[PDB]
Design a protein around this ligand. Sequence first.
Ligand SMILES: *[C@@H]1O[C@H](CO)[C@@H](O)[C@H](O)[C@H]1NC(C)=O
Ligand SMILES: [Cl-]
Ligand SMILES: [Cl-]
Ligand SMILES: [Cl-]
Ligand SMILES: [Cl-]
Ligand SMILES: [Cl-]
Length: 173
Amino acid sequence: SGPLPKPSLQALPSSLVPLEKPVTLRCQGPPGVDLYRLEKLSSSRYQDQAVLFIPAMKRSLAGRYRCSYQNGSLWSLPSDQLELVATGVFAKPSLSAQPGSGGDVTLQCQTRYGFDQFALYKEGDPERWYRASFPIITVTAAHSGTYRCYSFSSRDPYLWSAPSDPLELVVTG
Ligand SMILES: *[C@@H]1O[C@H](CO)[C@@H](O)[C@H](O)[C@H]1NC(C)=O
Ligand SMILES: [Cl-]
Ligand SMILES: [Cl-]
Ligand SMILES: [Cl-]
Ligand SMILES: [Cl-]
Ligand SMILES: [Cl-]
């Protein structure tokens, strides 16, 4: 007999978690299943409950998580892997911005360490995210708003810097 459809695995309030802040991971499949199994891939340790409450985020809790449920003798396909990120592990980078060509805006996420990954975002609902393997990013048709940037290493991509101080982009003439 074949497996069941995958559950979802979600971090609330967010999967981007500052060190020392709370996060809850929740596995959710169909109503009435018999067992949920939630694991962390780095340790291959697991708990047989759908909910994991982390009162205060730690570096060692960052990384990929996955869950499956069982019903009868049958297992589900596993969830998409949740990528739990610890922020604030390293000093914050410095974010600057300049007009580019046309409506392009150049954002620079500058650091002292030798980082090779950078995530930039504009506050809002929804948030606009940009990610790059180099510290200069061109945002095409950039929107006005509040931007911040994180730096990290591709060798452990789940441990991020503190976010940069905000920069305010005013596109309106
Ligand atoms: C779980 O198994 C029971 C029968 O043992 C069945 O009634 C129910 O619909 C199953 N649930 C899912 C989500 O497949
Ligand atoms: Cl199925
Ligand atoms: Cl969920
Ligand atoms: Cl955030
Ligand atoms: Cl630290
Ligand atoms: Cl540019």
